[PDB]
Amino acid sequence: PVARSWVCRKTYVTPRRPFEKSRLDQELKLIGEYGLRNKREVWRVKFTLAKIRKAARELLTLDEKDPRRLFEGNALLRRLVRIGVLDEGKMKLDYILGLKIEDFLERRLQTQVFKLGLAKSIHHARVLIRQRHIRVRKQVVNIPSFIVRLDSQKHIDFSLRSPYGGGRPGRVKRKNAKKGQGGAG
Amino acid sequence: GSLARVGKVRGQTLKVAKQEKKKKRTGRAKRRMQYNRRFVNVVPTFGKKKGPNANS
Amino acid sequence: TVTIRTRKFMTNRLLQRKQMVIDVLHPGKATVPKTEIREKLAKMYKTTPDVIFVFGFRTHFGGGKTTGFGMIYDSLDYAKKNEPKHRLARHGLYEKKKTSRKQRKERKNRMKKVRGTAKANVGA
Amino acid sequence: GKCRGLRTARKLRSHRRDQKWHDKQYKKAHLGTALKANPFGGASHAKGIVLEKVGVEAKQPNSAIRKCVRVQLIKNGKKITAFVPNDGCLNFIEENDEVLVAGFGRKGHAVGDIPGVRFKVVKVANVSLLALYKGKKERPR
RNA sequence: ACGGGGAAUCAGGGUUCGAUUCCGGAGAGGGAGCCUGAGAAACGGCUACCACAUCCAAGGAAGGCAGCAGGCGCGCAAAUUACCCACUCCCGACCCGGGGAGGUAGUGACGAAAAAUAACAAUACAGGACUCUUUCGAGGCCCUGUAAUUGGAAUGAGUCCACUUUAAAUCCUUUAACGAGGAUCCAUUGGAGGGCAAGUCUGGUGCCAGCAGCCGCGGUAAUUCCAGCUCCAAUAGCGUAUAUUAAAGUUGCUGCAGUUAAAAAGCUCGUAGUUGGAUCUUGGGAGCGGCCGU
């Protein structure tokens, strides 16, 4: 009778066939082209669309101009506009399925270091985010799986405890005070 | 039957000592060359799709 | 540098308390301890640093912000009335007893042997 | 469905309820005949004391001795032929020793060239047969 | 077989599961009878009988963990004889009282979420959209490299003053000084014929020992054994065994099948059951829509 949650779900699909050459071909291209950590990191990217798809397939199949359709069909056209993929005026409940796997990594913060042109390469959209040197509106972010909306893309900027932002020089420049200023005094 | 010659072939493999190892890159670090080597390091040449360990 | 704006101010008169959701801004330093903050509404809302019970500084992911809280009471005659006894040991003028539950929940119940008034022939 | 009628739910359900017993997997999981005759008795594993060793001959074209172990369990007191899984690991098993015994995979069936031997050894008295074969743990005595 | 709220799987239907924290019931070793109280047929009440079992000064007493730890037995199988009135809200005479309820720390790879073990600059050395020249080579804006090159850079493991945190703190956290070049801050667990991603490599074994879910492999050339190497898969996980669901259109409502693969009673009669022929209000009357919809 304890005040404990126990409310937890999985994030990634359990891939039905284990040694499709096509799966080891197609879903390994989603590592080096986008900089990911293992095959588990590739697998949840579909599951987020598998959540979107499952209702979106059925949010067309409701009655024509029904207020349960026209609110919940437009409740997702208030949702999937906001994340910043489908157009501002050319939003449409029918084009929602016309939407592929990397459309998340076109918008998701795991890539957004490389996207605007504020990186070195594709892999560089992990290591700065591994050490929380960026933020979203005076709010530091260490987890690279942040859902950046349409609105807060220009607000993707740097922290104040960051030598690669608007901050102070760090530790090895202070540990070079043992090598450089140890030999200089 | 003959519970005497049990594990006959286990013992008589001349124990060739395990040659030492620089640890393989782990986590994401495995999956960098594994992107480069499969797709983009090589040019598609003439013939069949060859094997990784195919020591012909 | 603790730039405090006393946000969401509300006067409860049936607990006689001036309460607010102080939105705190103090970037660069560590956490702001409970040594300095009661001395700011000594120079902001100009009451005593003695009757106010300031607590609940909630950090966001980064550690350059909290959002605080305090309650002004009318006097030190009201400093221990609409305030439970846990927070009144937190400023010196009150101390809990030391006798542990493995004594106390047993000391009252070790006396359960012999009948009546003079049960105190067991535990001291 | 040979009958399709609108008020035929008390023949579709009753006929399905009858013909489901002719399913050999269903009847096995729903009678009190198979459940009791299982040497384990609805268990995934079982400890048992080794009371002799049997060099079971390999079934067909493969002529080899599958060095197995006769095992009487604790919970039942019923006897079991137990295959010693990895190479020549019968010399880690001695008579009157508690061994942890599992099934093999085909679910109460003789797997491969061991005729009627339905079980395998996993551990020998709280040291695994893997660690004994790999050389990671010492024999517990 | 405690039931339901639910759970797992799921095109659609379905199928298995629910002892487990919320609700309803039931029980306090087994039954049975009762006092008290508004409310028990109560067992952290009592009285017996039946079983179990600790005292005994051997006359006679005392007892219920399916409350919380902890034994013992059982087994494949499951923790420390931690820490309080702070949320709650109830009980009490009642703001002052008191509650292993509620409630915090250990053991915890049952599980689920995040997440390290190099991302960058240029010397190693190979490519190509490219200028040139038959190939050559130079030249190099746009990167792809990675080899026991040089490296610099950092946040976070280990070690940590303190406080925001707490019914006392500890743990992330907020955070000081200290703490990374085989970044010893070191990743294993399985397979490597086929299904099925990945060696016709070398010794050793010689139908032996074994591997192998299935097919099968070993008969002195073993791509399968036992090993070394390199590789492949997943990755702080993975292998295994059992029940169970999908695959199973191999239980068929959607959706199977019955000449010969398993199967139509030998044959009609027949009662419930199941299913049952056509047939009973038709067109125009009255305004508008851009002959005819409403």
Phi, psi of A168 (to 5 degrees): -100, 150
Measuring CA to CA, how many Å separate C51 from each of A46, C39, C93?
57, 12, 12
Cβ-based burial of C2 (10 A; exposed 0-12, middle 13-18, buried ≥19)? middle
Which residues are registered as beta bridge partners of D110? none
Chain A contacts of B38, Cβ < 8 Å? Answer: 28
Say how far apart CA B11 and CA B13 lie, in whole Å: 6
**Backbone φ and ψ of D101, nearest 5°:** -115, 130
In a domain, A185, yes or no: no
d(CA C25, CA C113): 61
D89 to chain B: closest CA residue = B7
Residues 41-100 of chain A within 7 A of strand E, judged by CB, are: 41, 43-44
**Structural domain count of chain D:** 1
Resolution of the solved structure (Å) = 3.1
Say if CB C120 and CB C111 are below 8 A apart: yes
Distances (CA, A) of C98 to C101, C114, C119: 10, 26, 22
Provide the residue range defining the domain that includes D133.
1-141
Inside any domain, residue A131: yes
User: Which structural domain, as residue segments, surrounds residue A122?
Assistant: 18-180
Residue A10 lies in a domain: no
DSSP annotation of D42 reads S
Token duo for residue A11: 């994030």
Q: Is C107 on the interface with A (CB under 8 A)?
A: no
User: What count of other Cβ atoms lies within 10 Å of the Cβ of residue D83?
Assistant: 19
| Chains sharing 3 or more CB pairs under 8 A with chain D | B
| Number of structural domains chain A divides into | 1
**Interchain CB distance below 8 Å, A32 and B28:** no
Q: Give the structural domain span for C24.
A: 1-124
Using DSSP bridges, classify how beta strands C5-12 and A140-141 pair: parallel, antiparallel or unpaired: unpaired
- The Cα–Cα gap between A148 and C121 comes to 72
Task: Report residue A170 CA to chain centroid gap.
Answer: 28
Span CA (C1) to C1' (E103), Å: 39
Through-space distance between the first and last CA atoms of chain B, rounded to whole angstroms: 43
Which chain A residues have any C-beta within 8 angstroms of a chain B C-beta? 28-29, 31-33, 35-38, 123, 126
Nucleotide nearest to A133 (CA to C1'): E155
- Method by which this entry was solved: cryo-EM
- The shortest CB-CB distance from A28 to any of B27, B28, B35 is to B35
Q: Could you tell me if C91 and C73 are in contact, meaning their C-beta atoms sit under 8 angstroms apart?
A: no
- Tokens representing A48 are 């987020």
Residue with the two structure tokens 């679910």: D107
* Length of chain C, in residues: 124
The CATH number given to whatever domain includes residue C67 is: 3.30.70.3370
Nucleotide nearest to B52 (CA to C1'): E231
3-state class percentages of chain B: helix first, strand second, coil last, to nearest 5: 25, 0, 75
The SS3 assignment for A168 reads coil
Sign of the dihedral defined by the CA atoms of residues A98, A109, A26, A58, in that order: negative
Domain count along chain C: 1
How many C-beta atoms lie closer than 10 Å to residue A169's C-beta? Answer: 9
